[PDB]
Structures are given as structure tokens and as C-alpha cells.
Design a protein around this ligand. Structure first.
Ligand code: CA
Ligand code: CL
Length: 644
């Protein structure tokens, strides 16, 4: 690999610390700006000796023009083509050292099939009718969101989904779709749940080796965590990957429809690594800059995906931020979930949060704040240890996850719901939003908006499958009750509740622990199973409604939680708490919540706060008597209230 002739850049190597400050482009116009009169190109490539715009008439054709660019300011190259380039494709050809490379524009906003050429297009021809009038469903606080994590192919590819455009963005725009026994499916199923945000697994353009966009007439599946073009949609989710405008219009139609039906959209984004550090446009155009290196000038591989993006270098920080803002401004996206956020530096994350706040503070930022080794210094990683430096950014609460359903790696290990011993405090830490509540009840969050509660996601075994691995002597009914209890804990805890699509019908992957490239038979939303679980779907719907009806479950600040949340007297394998004195403006004076993981009957003394009434789980109540006494039986949640 040739990193360039350093005489081009004042003798400074691309690895040298002084490189960053020499070539920081201050303009917002990297990429190509098309108009019928002319197209303007700007490419950042400080180490190149030569740069060309290569024009193509067809995605797979030969060049029709090969035009040298002019060296410009702050490491950029420019070129104006004073012709109507509409419908053409282009690449950049550069010479770095003795090596020649041809690459897609890193600022590509449209591509041909499989993302190997940039498409020149009038962007506003891709907008749906009335796109400028698109209005977001209201959202007051992040703790008022209920997130539903969904893969575009999973949603509709089951053969009984009743959805026309199976596997596609458009498949999630279809209302009225019906499945086995006539149940609602697709969009109608999701809106019927009452969730507020759909978090979509990678919808940016991922690699051909993951899904080949020219082979969609045979089996295909991938989560898509292999980024290729950060600023354009994935082609396999469009009706026609060969038409550059189709995937853009169809994604916008999807976001437009979801907004009209009361739903916001969160994008799963993967700025921590690329699909191939050797082949990506970054390395072809400016080798050694955009990715992290170890001391021997090989890739740092903290991702375990082959490479890491050097988010901390200013041009890559700029790249990530301008990418996020493109998705906000062009696609009206409502939030971002940062894959392996602990690989991204704190300054970059806080600048992202600031630039989003300037546009719309209700836009969500959550991420995987795992502690992970990388050449990025420890005190600069955007992870749980450093959460006090990352205000307003949510992090998946793995401590809560493990306390509720048991250990994620030792498969037969029980947790709170399955009768394990000593998991009560871990559940309590999550009920409090992961904040510094007091005593032993403390996690990484300063404020509850920093804690995302979940017992299932696309990673690791589903909740149902983990239960099946850890309850050898349990019946199916007993396992269903444990599953329901876990869901109720997520939806009655402080912080941001997060559900995995299909968790409402006890989604199984047949024991597959990491299904990233498993076939659709493993990964689809099984609408047959959904039709067999309509009671469990109604139960999830009623928990979501319960949380919506009670602002006390959604306290915005740690101070309010410390003032109004109190844990109550309880035996082992149970957790009991109150939310007192119209917490968060709740309509009821007090709430009492019982998480019962004991299959037997039991009796509790209630706090002497007034005349308790049932609000939820009345099916579990053997007696409620005004000391005040509650008797219950069975694994499940009960909620009481003292009326105003
Ligand atoms: Ca692709
Ligand atoms: Cl059935």
C-alpha cells in the first residue's frame, strides 16, 4: 500500500500528528452539486498527485470523458462540467504515490446497482408528493419514546405476511395487510402495538458480499453491518436496484408513511468500521487517513470487523457529522442508534448531539456504549465509564438486561425472571433508570435519558430462546409467564424502553445466537407464530398503554427519580416499588408496582399511602384489602394506584 509521496504535502506523512491541522476543509460542498447548466465536483484528497472525474453513460459501461481536476484549497480538488450531466454516472480516479485507484464519491448521494459508481441526479425529483409538508409525530422527552427494533427484510418476507412488496421499504408502507387467520400484519401490526419509534437495522448501502443487489431472484439475507456507501440507501430494499432514484423515493415514501401513521424512525448507523479497509473509497482516495492504525501501520481492529474509522481526525469527524445531517435533512430521520459507539470518540459524539439539538432536540441519539480496547485512548471513548461527558446520549443498559433474563454468554444461567438467586438489586438499578440512586443502587447514567432498557434485541439469543436455554424444568406456560414478566419490567422502568420486533409474540430464532447472515427461515417475522400469540400481543399492547397513561414511569430527571421512587418490603424473587406524589405529573397520587418471579401465592403489606386500587395485572390478584394487604399468585406484574 502506497501512502503517497510526501513532497506533495510539505514532507508531512499522513500518519504524522501535524497532518490533521494542514488540510481541514471548512466548506460544506464536498461531493457533486448538479444543475442542468453545470455540475460542480469537489473531492478531498491531499496526498494525491493527480485526480480525475471519470464520466460514464451506463452503470457497467466504459468512460465517455476523463477530466483532470484542479488542486484547490485545504487539500481539495475541484472541477466544473458546464454541460447537463443528468443521468450520467461518475467516479474519481486518483494517483497516490505510484498507485492508481478509481472510487465512488465518499459523498455519493445516489449510486448504480451495487454502489460501484456515483449517480448524478436531480435530488428533488426523488421527493414524494408533499414531502416538504412532512410533519413529525409529537415527542416531548426521550423517556416518552417506545422503540421497536426492526429489519426491513424480516418485516414482510414470510410467505404468509400478506404484504405485496416483500423484503422492501415499500412493504412497510402497506396498510390493511392480513396474515394467517386474518390477523393484522406489517405496518398495521406495529401501529396497533402503540410503539412510537421504529428503529431500522442498516438501511444505508451495505456491501455486495453481504447481499448482491444483482442476485435478488435467489435467496439472500444480511443484517447489513458492512458499510459501503454511508449516504445512500441500500439497494436490495428497493423495487429496482438498477434505477438510482427508486431506492431514494421508496425510502422517503416509507418515512413519510410512518410519520403519517404516528411513528418516528431511528436509523442504525455504523460509523465505527467499513466493510473492507483495503477496498473502501476512503483508502483508495486518501490511504492512511480515514481508518485507525496500530504502531506498525496495520489496521487497529477493535471492532473485530477488520478496521476502525478514525472518528477523532477532523476530516473524518466532519464526514460522520455531515453524513448524519444528510440523513436528517434529506430523509427526515428522527434518531440515530450508534453501533459500537464506544469505538467513537467523545468529542465527535457531543458535536453530533449539538448539531442535532440545533435542528430538533427531540431527535434521538442512543448507542452501544461498551468498554472496548482500541488505539483510541480510554478517556476519549464514548462509553458507559465516560457517560458523565456524554449528556443526552442514551446507552443500552446491559446490566439491567442480564439481571432480568440471566447471563448473555453462559446460556443456562438463570436471572431474576427465571428464579435465579440474588438478582433483585440488579433489577432495581434498572428500575431507577441506571442513575446514581443511592447506596448499592447506582449505574453509569447521570440522567435517565442515558439508559435504554431492553431484554431482547437483534444481537444474541431472543428472550424466548434464552429462557429455553435456562429453564430445564419449566413448562411452556411457565416460560411464557417469565417472558411476559421481562417485557413488563422494561416498560415500567425509568429510562427509555426498547423492544425487539416480534418480542410481542415470543420471537424465536430456533436457538440461533448470532443470526446476521442466517436465512429468512431463521430471521423473518413469523406471522404464523404471531397469529398463535394474539393474547401475548394484546398483553404487550396493554403494557405500552399503561406506560403511556402514567407519566410517573417516564421521569425526565434523576432528581425526580430520587425524590419520588421508593423500593418497598419484599421477599426474595420479587421486587416492589412505589412512585409517590403525582410523580412527573401523573394523574394518580401514587403507584405501586410488584414484579413477582415466584410461581406460588404470596401476601405483601402495602405502604400506608391511601386506598389502593388495581390498575394492571388484576388477573393475578387473590386479594386487595385496605394494614393494607395484597395477595397474588403466579409470575407476573401487578400495578396499583392511590387515586387523586
Ligand atoms: Ca448494497
Ligand atoms: Cl393459530
Amino acid at each position: 500500500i502506497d501512502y503517497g509521496d510526501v513532497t506533495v504535502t510539505g514532507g508531512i506523512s499522513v500518519f504524522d500528528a501535524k497532518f490533521d491541522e494542514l488540510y481541514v476543509y471548512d466548506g460544506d460542498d464536498l461531493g457533486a452539486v448538479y444543475a442542468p447548466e453545470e455540475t460542480r465536483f469537489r473531492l478531498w484528497a491531499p496526498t494525491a498527485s493527480e485526480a480525475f472525474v471519470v464520466l460514464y453513460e451506463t452503470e457497467d459501461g466504459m468512460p465517455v470523458k476523463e477530466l483532470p481536476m484542479k488542486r484547490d484549497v485545504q487539500g481539495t480538488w475541484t472541477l466544473t462540467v458546464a454541460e447537463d450531466c443528468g443521468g450520467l454516472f461518475y467516479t474519481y480516479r486518483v494517483k497516490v504515490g505510484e498507485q492508481w485507484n478509481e472510487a465512488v464519491d465518499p459523498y455519493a448521494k445516489a449510486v448504480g446497482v451495487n454502489g460501484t459508481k456515483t449517480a448524478i441526479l436531480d435530488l428533488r425529483s426523488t421527493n414524494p408528493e408533499g414531502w416538504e409538508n412532512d410533519q413529525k409525530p409529537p415527542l416531548a422527552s426521550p423517556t416518552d419514546a417506545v422503540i421497536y427494533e426492526l429489519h426491513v427484510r424480516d418485516l414482510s418476507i414470510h410467505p404468509q405476511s400478506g404484504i405485496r412488496e416483500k423484503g422492501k421499504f415499500l412493504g412497510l408502507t402497506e396498510e390493511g395487510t392480513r396474515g394467517p387467520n386474518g390477523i393484522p400484519t406489517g405496518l398495521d401490526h406495529i401501529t396497533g402495538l402503540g410503539v412510537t419509534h421504529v428503529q431500522l437495522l442498516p438501511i444505508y448501502d451495505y456491501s455486495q458480499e453481504s447481499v448482491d443487489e444483482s442476485r435478488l431472484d435467489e435467496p439472500h439475507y444480511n443484517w447489513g453491518y458492512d458499510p459501503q456507501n454511508y449516504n445512500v440507501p441500500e439497494g436490495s430494499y428497493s423495487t429496482d436496484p438498477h434505477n438510482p432514484a427508486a431506492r431514494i423515493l421508496e425510502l422517503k415514501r416509507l418515512i413519510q408513511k410512518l410519520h403519517a401513521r404516528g411513528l418516528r424512525v431511528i436509523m442504525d448507523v455504523v460509523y465505527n468500521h467499513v466493510y473492507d479497509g483495503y477496498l473502501i473509497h476512503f483508502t483508495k482516495l486518501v490511504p492512511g487517513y480515514y481508518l485507525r492504525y496500530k504502531a506498525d501501520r496495520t489496521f487497529s481492529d477493535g471492532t473485530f470487523c477488520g478496521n476502525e474509522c478514525a472518528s477523532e481526525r477532523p476530516i473524518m469527524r466532519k464526514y460522520i457529522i455531515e453524513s448524519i445531517l444528510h440523513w436528517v435533512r434529506e430523509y427526515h430521520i428522527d434518531g440515530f442508534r450508534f453501533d459500537l459507539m464506544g469505538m467513537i470518540d467523545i468529542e465527535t459524539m457531543n458535536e453530533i448531539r449539538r448539531r442535532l439539538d440545533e435542528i430538533d432536540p427531540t431527535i434521538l441519539t442512543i448507542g452501544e456504549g461498551w468498554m472496548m480496547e482500541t488505539v483510541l485512548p480510554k478517556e476519549l471513548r464514548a462509553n458507559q465509564d465516560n457517560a458523565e461527558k456524554l449528556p443526552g446520549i442514551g446507552m443500552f443498559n446491559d446490566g439491567m438486561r442480564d439481571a432480568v433474563k440471566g447471563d448473555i454468554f453462559i446460556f443456562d444461567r438463570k436471572g431474576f425472571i427465571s428464579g435465579g438467586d440474588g438478582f433483585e438489586d440488579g433489577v432495581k438499578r434498572g428500575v431507577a433508570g441506571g442513575i446514581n440512586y443511592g447506596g448499592q443502587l447506582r449505574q453509569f447514567a447521570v440522567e435517565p435519558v442515558q439508559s435504554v432498557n431492553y431484554v431482547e434485541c437483534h444481537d444474541n439469543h431472543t428472550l424466548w430462546d434464552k429462557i429455553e436455554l435456562s429453564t430445564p424444568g419449566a413448562s411452556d406456560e411457565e416460560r411464557r409467564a417469565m417472558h411476559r414478566l421481562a417485557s413488563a419490567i422494561v416498560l415500567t422502568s425509568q429510562g427509555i424502553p426498547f423492544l425487539h420486533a416480534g418480542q410481542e409474540f415470543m420471537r424465536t430464532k430456533g436457538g440461533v445466537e448470532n443470526s446476521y447472515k442466517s436465512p429468512i427461515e431463521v430471521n423473518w417475522l413469523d406471522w404464523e407464530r404471531c397469529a398463535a400469540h394474539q393474547d401475548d400481543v394484546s398483553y404487550m399492547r396493554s403494557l405500552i398503554a399503561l406506560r403511556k397513561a402514567h407519566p410517573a414511569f417516564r421521569l425526565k430527571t434523576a432528581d425526580e427519580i430520587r425524590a419520588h421512587l421508593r423500593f418497598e418490603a419484599a421477599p426474595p424473587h420479587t421486587v416492589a416499588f412505589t412512585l409517590r406524589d403525582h410523580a412527573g405529573g401523573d394523574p394518580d397520587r401514587h403507584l405501586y408496582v410488584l414484579y413477582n418471579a415466584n410461581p406460588g401465592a404470596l401476601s405483601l403489606e402495602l405502604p400506608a399511602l391511601g386506598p389502593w386500587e388495581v390498575r394492571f395485572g388484576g388477573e393475578h390478584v387473590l386479594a386487595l384489602e385496605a394494614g393494607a394487604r395484597l395477595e397474588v399468585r403466579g409470575v407476573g406484574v401487578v400495578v396499583l394506584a392511590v387515586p387523586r
